[PDB]
PDB file of C-alpha atoms in Angstrom:
ATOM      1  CA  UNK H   1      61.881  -5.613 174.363  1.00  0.00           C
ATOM      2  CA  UNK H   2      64.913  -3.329 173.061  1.00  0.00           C
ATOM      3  CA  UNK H   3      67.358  -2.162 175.313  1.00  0.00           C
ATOM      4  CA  UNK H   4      70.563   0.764 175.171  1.00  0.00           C
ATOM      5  CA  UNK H   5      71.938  -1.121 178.159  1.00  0.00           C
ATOM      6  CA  UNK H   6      70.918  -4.862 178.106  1.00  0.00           C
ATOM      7  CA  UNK H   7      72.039  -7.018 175.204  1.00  0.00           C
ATOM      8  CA  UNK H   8      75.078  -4.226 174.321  1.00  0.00           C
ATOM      9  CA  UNK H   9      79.042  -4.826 174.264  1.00  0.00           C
ATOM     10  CA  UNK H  10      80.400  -4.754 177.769  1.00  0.00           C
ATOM     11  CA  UNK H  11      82.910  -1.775 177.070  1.00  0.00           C
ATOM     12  CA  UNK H  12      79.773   0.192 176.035  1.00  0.00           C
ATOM     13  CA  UNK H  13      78.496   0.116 180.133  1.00  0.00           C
ATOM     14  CA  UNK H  14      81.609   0.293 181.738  1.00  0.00           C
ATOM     15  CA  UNK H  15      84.362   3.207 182.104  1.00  0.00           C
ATOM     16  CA  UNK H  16      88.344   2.325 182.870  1.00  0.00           C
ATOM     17  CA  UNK H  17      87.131   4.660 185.793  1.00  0.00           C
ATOM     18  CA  UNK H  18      84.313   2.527 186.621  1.00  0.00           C
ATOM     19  CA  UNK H  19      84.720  -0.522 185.661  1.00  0.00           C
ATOM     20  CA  UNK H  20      81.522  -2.488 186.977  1.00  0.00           C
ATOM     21  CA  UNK H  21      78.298  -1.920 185.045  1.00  0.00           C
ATOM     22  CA  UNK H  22      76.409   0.202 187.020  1.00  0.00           C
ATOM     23  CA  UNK H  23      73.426  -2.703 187.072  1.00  0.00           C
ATOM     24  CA  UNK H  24      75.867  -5.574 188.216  1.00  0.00           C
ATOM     25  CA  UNK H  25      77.120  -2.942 191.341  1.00  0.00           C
ATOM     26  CA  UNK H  26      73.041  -2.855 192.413  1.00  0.00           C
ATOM     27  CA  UNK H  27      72.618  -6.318 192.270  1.00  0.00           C
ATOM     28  CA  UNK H  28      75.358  -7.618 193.910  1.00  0.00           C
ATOM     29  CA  UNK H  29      74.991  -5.070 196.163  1.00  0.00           C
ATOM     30  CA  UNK H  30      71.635  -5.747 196.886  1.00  0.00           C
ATOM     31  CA  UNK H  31      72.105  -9.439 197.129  1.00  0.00           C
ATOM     32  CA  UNK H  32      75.040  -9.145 199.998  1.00  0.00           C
ATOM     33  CA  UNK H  33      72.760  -6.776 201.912  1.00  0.00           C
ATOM     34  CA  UNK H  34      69.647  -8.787 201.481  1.00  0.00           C
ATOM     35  CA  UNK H  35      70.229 -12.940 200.594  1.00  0.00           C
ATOM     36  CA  UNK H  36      73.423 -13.926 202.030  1.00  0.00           C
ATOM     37  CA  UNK H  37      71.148 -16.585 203.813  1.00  0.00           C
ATOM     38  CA  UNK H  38      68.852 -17.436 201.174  1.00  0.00           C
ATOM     39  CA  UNK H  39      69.000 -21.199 200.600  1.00  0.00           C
ATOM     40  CA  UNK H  40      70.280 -22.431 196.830  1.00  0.00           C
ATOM     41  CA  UNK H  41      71.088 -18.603 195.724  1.00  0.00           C
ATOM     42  CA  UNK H  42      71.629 -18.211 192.069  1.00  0.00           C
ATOM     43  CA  UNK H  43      70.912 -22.024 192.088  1.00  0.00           C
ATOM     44  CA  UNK H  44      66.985 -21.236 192.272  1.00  0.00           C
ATOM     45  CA  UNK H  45      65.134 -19.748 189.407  1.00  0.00           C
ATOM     46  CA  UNK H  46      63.361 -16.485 189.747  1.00  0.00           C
ATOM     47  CA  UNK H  47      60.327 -14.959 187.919  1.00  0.00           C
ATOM     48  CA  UNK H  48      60.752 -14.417 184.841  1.00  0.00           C
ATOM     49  CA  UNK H  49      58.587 -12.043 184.556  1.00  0.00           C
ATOM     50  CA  UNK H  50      60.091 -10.061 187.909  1.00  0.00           C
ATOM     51  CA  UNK H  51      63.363 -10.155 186.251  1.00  0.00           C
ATOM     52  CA  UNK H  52      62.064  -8.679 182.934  1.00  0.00           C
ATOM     53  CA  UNK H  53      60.424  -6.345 184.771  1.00  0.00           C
ATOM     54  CA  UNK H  54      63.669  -5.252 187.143  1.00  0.00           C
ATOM     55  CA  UNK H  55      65.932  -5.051 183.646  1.00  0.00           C
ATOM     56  CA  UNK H  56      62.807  -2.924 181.867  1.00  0.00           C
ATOM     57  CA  UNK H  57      62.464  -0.417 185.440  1.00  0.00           C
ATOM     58  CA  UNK H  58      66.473  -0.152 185.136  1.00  0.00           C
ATOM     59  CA  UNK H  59      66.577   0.808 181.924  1.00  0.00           C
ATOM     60  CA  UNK H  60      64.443   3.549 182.348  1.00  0.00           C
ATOM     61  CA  UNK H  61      66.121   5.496 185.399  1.00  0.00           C
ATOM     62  CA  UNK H  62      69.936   4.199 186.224  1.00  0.00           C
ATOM     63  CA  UNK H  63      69.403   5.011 190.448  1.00  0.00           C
ATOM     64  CA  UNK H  64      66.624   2.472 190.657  1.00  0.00           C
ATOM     65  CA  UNK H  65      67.077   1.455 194.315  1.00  0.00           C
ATOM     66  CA  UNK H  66      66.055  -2.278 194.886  1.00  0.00           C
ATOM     67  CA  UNK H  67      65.460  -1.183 198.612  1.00  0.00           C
ATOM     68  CA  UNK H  68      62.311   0.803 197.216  1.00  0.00           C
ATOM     69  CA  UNK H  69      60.664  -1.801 194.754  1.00  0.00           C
ATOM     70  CA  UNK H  70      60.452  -4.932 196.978  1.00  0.00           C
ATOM     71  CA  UNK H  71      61.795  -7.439 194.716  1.00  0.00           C
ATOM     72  CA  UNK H  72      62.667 -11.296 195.596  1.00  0.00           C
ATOM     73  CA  UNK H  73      66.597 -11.545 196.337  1.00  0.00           C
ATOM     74  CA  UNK H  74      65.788 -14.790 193.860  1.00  0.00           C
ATOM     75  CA  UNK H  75      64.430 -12.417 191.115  1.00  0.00           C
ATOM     76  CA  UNK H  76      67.405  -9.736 191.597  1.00  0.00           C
ATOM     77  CA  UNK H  77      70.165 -12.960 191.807  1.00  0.00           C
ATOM     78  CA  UNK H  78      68.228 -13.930 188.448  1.00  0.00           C
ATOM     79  CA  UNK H  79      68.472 -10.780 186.763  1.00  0.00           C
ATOM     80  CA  UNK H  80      72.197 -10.267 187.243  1.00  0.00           C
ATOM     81  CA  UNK H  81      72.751 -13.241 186.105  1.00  0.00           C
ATOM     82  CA  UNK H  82      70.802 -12.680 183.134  1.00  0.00           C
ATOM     83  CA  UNK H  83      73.047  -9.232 182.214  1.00  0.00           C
ATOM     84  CA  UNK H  84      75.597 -11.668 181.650  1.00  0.00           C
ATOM     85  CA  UNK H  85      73.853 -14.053 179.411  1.00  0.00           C
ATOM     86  CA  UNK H  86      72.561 -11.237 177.103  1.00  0.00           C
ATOM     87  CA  UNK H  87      76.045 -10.171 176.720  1.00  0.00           C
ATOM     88  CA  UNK H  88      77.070 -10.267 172.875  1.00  0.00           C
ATOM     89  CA  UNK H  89      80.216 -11.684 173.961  1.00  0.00           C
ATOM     90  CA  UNK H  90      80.441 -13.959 177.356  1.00  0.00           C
ATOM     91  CA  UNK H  91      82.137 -12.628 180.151  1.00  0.00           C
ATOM     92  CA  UNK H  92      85.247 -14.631 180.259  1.00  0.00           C
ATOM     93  CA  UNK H  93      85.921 -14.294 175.868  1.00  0.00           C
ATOM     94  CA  UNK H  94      86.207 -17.848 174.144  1.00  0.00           C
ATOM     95  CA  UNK H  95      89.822 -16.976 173.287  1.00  0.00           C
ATOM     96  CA  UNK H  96      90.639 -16.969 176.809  1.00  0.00           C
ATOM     97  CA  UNK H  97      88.823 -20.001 177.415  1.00  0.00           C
ATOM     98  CA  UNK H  98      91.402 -22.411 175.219  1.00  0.00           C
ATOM     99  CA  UNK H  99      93.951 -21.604 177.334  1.00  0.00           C
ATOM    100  CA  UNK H 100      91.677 -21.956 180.525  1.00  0.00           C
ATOM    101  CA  UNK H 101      91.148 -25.204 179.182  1.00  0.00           C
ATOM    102  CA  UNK H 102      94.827 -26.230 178.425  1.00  0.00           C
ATOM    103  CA  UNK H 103      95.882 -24.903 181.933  1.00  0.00           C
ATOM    104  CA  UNK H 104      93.910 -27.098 183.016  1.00  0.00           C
ATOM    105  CA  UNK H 105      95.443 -30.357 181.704  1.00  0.00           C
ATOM    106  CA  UNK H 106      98.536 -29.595 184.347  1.00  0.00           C
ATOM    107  CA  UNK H 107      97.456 -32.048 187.220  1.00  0.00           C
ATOM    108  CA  UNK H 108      99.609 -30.508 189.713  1.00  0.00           C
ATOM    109  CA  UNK H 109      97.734 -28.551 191.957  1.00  0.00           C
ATOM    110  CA  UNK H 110     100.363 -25.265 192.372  1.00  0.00           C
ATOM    111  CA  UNK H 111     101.439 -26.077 188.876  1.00  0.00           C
ATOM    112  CA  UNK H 112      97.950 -25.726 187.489  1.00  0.00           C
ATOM    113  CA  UNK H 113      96.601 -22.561 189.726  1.00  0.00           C
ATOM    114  CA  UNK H 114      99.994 -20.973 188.157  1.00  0.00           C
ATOM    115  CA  UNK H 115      99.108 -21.576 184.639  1.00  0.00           C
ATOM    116  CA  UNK H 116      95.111 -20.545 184.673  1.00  0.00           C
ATOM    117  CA  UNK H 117      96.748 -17.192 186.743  1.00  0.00           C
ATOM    118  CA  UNK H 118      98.790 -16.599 183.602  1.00  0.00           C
ATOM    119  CA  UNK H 119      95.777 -16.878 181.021  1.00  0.00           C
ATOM    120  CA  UNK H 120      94.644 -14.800 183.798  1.00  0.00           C
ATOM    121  CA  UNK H 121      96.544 -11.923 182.699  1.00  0.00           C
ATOM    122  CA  UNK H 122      95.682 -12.063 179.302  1.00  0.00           C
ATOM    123  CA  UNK H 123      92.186 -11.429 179.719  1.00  0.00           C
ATOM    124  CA  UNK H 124      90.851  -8.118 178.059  1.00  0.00           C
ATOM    125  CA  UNK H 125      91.160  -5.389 180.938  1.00  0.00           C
ATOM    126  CA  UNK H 126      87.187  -4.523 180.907  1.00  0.00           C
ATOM    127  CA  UNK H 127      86.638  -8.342 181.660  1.00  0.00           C
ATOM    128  CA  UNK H 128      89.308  -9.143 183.791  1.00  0.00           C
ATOM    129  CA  UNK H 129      87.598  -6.077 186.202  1.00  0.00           C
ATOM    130  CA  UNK H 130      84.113  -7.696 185.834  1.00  0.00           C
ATOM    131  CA  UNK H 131      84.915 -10.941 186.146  1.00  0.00           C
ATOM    132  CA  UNK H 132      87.252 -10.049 189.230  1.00  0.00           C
ATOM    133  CA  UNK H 133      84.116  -8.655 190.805  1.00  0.00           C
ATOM    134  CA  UNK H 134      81.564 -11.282 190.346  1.00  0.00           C
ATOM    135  CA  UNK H 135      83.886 -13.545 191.269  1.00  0.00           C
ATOM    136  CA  UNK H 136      84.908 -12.370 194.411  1.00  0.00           C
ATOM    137  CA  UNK H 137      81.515 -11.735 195.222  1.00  0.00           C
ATOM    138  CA  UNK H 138      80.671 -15.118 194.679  1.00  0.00           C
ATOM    139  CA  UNK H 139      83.557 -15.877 196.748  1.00  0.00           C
ATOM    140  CA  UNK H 140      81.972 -14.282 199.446  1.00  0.00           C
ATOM    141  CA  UNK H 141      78.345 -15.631 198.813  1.00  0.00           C
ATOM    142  CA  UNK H 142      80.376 -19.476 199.328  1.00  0.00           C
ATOM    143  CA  UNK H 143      81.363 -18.518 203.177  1.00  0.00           C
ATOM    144  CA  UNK H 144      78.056 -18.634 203.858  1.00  0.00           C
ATOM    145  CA  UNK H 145      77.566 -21.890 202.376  1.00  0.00           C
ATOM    146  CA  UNK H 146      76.733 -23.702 205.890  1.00  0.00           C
ATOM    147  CA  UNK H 147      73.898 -21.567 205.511  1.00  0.00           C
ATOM    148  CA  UNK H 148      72.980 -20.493 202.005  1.00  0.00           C
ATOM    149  CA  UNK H 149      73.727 -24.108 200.785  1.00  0.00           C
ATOM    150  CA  UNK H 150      75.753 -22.521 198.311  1.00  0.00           C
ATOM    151  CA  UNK H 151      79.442 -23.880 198.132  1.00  0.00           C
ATOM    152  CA  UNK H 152      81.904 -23.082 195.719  1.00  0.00           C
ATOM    153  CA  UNK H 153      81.385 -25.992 193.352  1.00  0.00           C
ATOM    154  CA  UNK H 154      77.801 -25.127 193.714  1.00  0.00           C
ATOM    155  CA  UNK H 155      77.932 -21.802 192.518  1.00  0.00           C
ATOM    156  CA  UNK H 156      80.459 -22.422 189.534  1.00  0.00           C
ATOM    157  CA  UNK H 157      77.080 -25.008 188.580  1.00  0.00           C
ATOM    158  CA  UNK H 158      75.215 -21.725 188.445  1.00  0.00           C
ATOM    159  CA  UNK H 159      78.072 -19.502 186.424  1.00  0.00           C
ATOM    160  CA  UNK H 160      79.955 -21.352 184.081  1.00  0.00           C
ATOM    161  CA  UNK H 161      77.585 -21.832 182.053  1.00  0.00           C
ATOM    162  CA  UNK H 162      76.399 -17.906 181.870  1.00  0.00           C
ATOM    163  CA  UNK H 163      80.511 -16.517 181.884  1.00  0.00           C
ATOM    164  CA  UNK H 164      81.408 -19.077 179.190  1.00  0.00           C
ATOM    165  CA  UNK H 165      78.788 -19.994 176.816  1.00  0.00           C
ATOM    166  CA  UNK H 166      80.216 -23.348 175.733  1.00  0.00           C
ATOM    167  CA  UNK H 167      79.260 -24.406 172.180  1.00  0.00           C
ATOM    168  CA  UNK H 168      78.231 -27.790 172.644  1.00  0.00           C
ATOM    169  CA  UNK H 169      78.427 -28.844 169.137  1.00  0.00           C
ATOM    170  CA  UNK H 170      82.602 -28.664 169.378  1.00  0.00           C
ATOM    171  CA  UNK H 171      83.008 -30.607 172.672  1.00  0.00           C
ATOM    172  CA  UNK H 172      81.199 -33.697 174.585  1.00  0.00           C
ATOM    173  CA  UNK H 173      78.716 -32.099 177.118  1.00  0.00           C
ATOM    174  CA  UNK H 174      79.209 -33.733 179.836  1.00  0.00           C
ATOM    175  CA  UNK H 175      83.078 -33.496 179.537  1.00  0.00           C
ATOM    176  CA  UNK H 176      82.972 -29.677 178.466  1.00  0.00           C
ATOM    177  CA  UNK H 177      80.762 -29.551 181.953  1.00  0.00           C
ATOM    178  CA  UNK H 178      83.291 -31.215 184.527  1.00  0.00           C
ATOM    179  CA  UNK H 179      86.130 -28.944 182.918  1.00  0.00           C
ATOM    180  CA  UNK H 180      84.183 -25.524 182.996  1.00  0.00           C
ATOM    181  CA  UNK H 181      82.765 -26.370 186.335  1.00  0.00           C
ATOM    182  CA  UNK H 182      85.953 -27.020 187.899  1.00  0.00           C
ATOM    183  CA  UNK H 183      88.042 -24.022 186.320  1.00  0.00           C
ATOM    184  CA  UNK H 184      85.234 -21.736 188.009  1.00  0.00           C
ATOM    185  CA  UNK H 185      85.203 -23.412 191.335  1.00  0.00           C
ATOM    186  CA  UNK H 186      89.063 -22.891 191.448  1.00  0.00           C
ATOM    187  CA  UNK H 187      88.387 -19.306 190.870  1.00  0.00           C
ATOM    188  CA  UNK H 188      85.928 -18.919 193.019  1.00  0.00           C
ATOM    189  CA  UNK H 189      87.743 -20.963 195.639  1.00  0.00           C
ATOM    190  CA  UNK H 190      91.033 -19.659 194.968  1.00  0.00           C
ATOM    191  CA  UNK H 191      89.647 -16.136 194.401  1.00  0.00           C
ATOM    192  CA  UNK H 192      92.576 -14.661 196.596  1.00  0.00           C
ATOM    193  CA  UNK H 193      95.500 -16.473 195.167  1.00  0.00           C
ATOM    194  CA  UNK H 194      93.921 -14.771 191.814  1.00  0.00           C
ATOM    195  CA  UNK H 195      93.201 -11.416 192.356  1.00  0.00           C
ATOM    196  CA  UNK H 196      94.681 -10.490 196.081  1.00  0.00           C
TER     197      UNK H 196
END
C-alpha cells in the first residue's frame, strides 16, 4: 500500500513546534497507558496484518484513538516500531553512527558516556527530538522490567536494529551487534545523564 505519512522523510511529519510524529505520540502513548506490564514488550511480534491495518486506519483520519479500535498493545508496540523501519533514513543517521561507534572505543566508563553525549549534540535537531522521546520512553518501559521482562539491554535487542539499520555487508554481524546493542542500552540506561 502507498502512504503520505508512512515510508516519508521524518522532517516531512514533524514541526520544530511539534516535534514527535503525531503517530509515534499515539503509540507510545497508548502503550504507557495500556502494556507497561505486558511480558517481552517490543520483544514479541505482533500481527502483521493488525499492524498494517493500524498504519492503513491512521492514515486515513490523524485522531484515530487506539482506546476505540481494540487493538493488541503487541500489535500497537509493533506498529511504532515499524514507523521507524519504513523511515527513508534511520532514526539515529549513519553519519552519526561512526562517531557513536568511535565513542565507543573509550573504555572508561565517564570517559565514554562523555564522548557518545558529544556525538550527541551533533545529531540533526528533528532526530535528536525523536530519538530523545523514544528513548526516554523506553527508559521508562525498563522500570518495569521486574514485571514486563523488559530490561534495558533487552529493549536496545528490540531497537538497534530498527534506529540504526546496520549494513551488514561493511562490518562482522555479530560484532556490529554487541557494539549497537550496547550504545543503545547506555542510552536507554543512561537516558538522564543524556537528555536531563
Amino acid at each position: 500500500w502507498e502512504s503520505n505519512y508512512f515510508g516519508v522523510p521524518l522532517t516531512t511529519v514533524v514541526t520544530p513546534e511539534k516535534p514527535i510524529p503525531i503517530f509515534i505520540e499515539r503509540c507510545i502513548e497508548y502503550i504507557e497507558a495500556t502494556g507497561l506490564s505486558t511480558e517481552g514488550i517490543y520483544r514479541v511480534s505482533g500481527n502483521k496484518s493488525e499492524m498494517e491495518s493500524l498504519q492503513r486506519q491512521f492514515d486515513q483520519d490523524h485522531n484515530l484513538d487506539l482506546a476505540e479500535k481494540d487493538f493488541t498493545v503487541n500489535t500497537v508496540a509493533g506498529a511504532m516500531k515499524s514507523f521507524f523501519s519504513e523511515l527513508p533514513d534511520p532514526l539515529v543517521p549513519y553519519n552519526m553512527q561512526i562517531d557513536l561507534v568511535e565513542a565507543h572505543k573509550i573504555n572508561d566508563r565517564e570517559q565514554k558516556l562523555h564522548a557518545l553525549k558529544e556525538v550527541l549534540k551533533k545529531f540533526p535537531k528533528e532526530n535528536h527530538e525523536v530519538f530523545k522521546y523514544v528513548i526516554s520512553h523506553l527508559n521508562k518501559v525498563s522500570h518495569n522490567n521486574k514485571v514486563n521482562l523488559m530490561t534495558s539491554e533487552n529493549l536496545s535487542i528490540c531497537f538497534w536494529p530498527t534506529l540504526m539499520r546496520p549494513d551488514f555487508s561493511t562490518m562482522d554481524a555479530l560484532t556490529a551487534t554487541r557494539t549497537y546493542q550496547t550504545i543503545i542500552e547506555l542510552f536507554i540506561q543512561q537516558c538522564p545523564f543524556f537528555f536531563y
